[PDB]
């Protein structure tokens, strides 16, 4: 079966036909016990001194609102994103997860990662099925050769430091810019530390164990001193996957 030919014939994307898309994942429970309270801050990231976000983070999830996300619907260009001072708030050993879209971001996001001192270690692809709307054509980017049915989240590492590099879900409704919550599952199961920052998060993405910072948040509870107290000794080096310290 040539699923490419089939997509040409019917409009059903090949990924519509992927199937099934240890057991002992009580790791999930230790993650939840380890999780800091959810903390969040409304901030215009363009006009905000990012250095006010302390302490330095073990993990940064960066989800700038690209123009390509609003096809029928403030957008950030890669010019804007590249000028964020991410290296000023990343711990010397730390990780980044950068949503890059499907166009020029696959290149400019790599430029960003290197600019901020990371090297890419994974390329995580969000593959979108169209099982519910096979008869709904694209509207291609002018430079596009193919219909674009996926987005990429690049994982970067800096310093000396179960899941697959694919997320498969149905294409969300038009004007819905949310990324699959599965990305949080992957990140948390790497057990990278407990200082976790989500830039350009929203009220809808706030999550235990994460500091969410973004312009559309309606409320804040962030206090730098309170947040830092979650990680003071004896808790400074926990992975987020082990039992709490009595």
């Amino acid at each position: 079966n040539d699923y490419c030919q089939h997509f040409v014939d019917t409009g059903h994307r090949p990924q519509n036909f992927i199937r099934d898309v240890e057991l002992i994942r009580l790791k999930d429970e230790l993650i939840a016990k380890s999780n800091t309270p959810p903390m969040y801050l409304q901030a215009d990231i363009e006009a905000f001194d990012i250095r006010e976000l302390t302490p330095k983070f073990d993990v940064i999830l960066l989800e700038p609102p690209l123009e390509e996300y609003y096809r029928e619907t403030k957008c950030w260009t890669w010019d804007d994103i590249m000028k964020l001072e991410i290296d000023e708030i990343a711990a010397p050993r730390s990780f980044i997860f950068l949503w890059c879209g499907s166009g020029e971001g696959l290149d400019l996001g790599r430029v960003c990662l290197r600019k901020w001192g990371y090297r890419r270690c994974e390329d995580i692809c969000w593959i979108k099925t169209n099982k519910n709307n096979p008869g709904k054509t694209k509207t291609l980017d002018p430079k596009a050769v193919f219909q674009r049915t996926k987005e990429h989240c690049l994982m970067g590492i800096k310093g000396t430091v179960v899941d697959i590099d694919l997320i498969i879900t149905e294409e969300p409704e038009i004007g819905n810019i949310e990324k699959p919550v599965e990305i949080f599952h992957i990140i948390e199961h790497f057990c990278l530390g407990r200082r976790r920052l989500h830039l350009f998060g929203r009220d809808s993405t706030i999550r235990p164990g994460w500091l969410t910072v973004g312009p559309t948040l309606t409320n804040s509870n962030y206090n730098a001193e309170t947040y830092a107290s979650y990680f003071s000794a004896p808790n400074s080096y926990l992975t987020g996957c082990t039992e709490e310290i009595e």
Binding site: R13, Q15, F17, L106, A144, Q147, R148, I164, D165, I186
Partner: protein, 198 residues
């Protein structure tokens, strides 16, 4: 000349100027992640192969970045990226942080291609894994629908990669099989005794 054609060669040393111009180039290089060094990859004479058209470049590991460098050095802009989701026979999915379910194929453009059927296929291939490094045959049908009837060239292909409308180059092919009279003539003029050295 439509039927499959091929040249067993060391792609580092073949004078690829004898081959003419191609609407589509595809390469699956043995990246140094029998490999080619980064410098040997950069120096491959890809620029002479096309004036206006597309390059399909398979990459893994750090060649996701090195492949982007080569693509740009050779004069292309990356404009798409095909993902091959690797499956078994039952359509189930088969880098030290994550298991890898996929391989990537960068799509570059050179010049201003006219008359290609862009947007017919989507950028995800779901196809069974076969032998090691054996890429899915689905890509040939995608490329044929994109650019029907035109001349194509594959670099680092194996015998099972030869296809109509394609010229295949690689060092595990069997001999030389050339039918296009333009190419035969220029091959004879350049390699009168059939030997491809230096």
């Amino acid at each position: 000349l439509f039927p499959p054609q091929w040249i067993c060669c060391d792609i580092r040393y073949l004078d690829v100027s004898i081959l003419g111009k191609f609407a589509v180039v595809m390469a699956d290089p043995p990246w140094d992640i029998g490999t080619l060094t980064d410098d040997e990859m950069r120096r491959l004479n890809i620029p002479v192969l096309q004036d206006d058209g597309f390059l399909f470049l398979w990459v893994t590991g750090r060649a996701m970045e090195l492949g982007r460098e080569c693509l740009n050095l050779w004069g292309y802009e990356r404009v798409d990226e095909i993902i091959w989701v690797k499956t078994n026979q039952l359509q189930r999915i088969i880098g030290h942080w994550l298991n890898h379910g996929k391989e990537h194929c960068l799509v570059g453009v050179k010049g201003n291609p006219q008359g290609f059927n862009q947007g017919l296929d989507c950028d995800v291939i779901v196809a069974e894994v076969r032998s090691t490094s054996h890429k899915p045959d689905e890509i040939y049908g995608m490329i044929e629908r994109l650019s029907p009837g035109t001349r194509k060239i594959e670099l680092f292909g194996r015998p099972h990669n030869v296809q109509p409308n394609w010229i295949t180059l690689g060092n595990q092919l069997d001999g030389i099989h050339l039918l296009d009279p333009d190419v035969v003539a220029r091959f004879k003029q350049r390699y009168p005794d059939g030997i491809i050295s230096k």
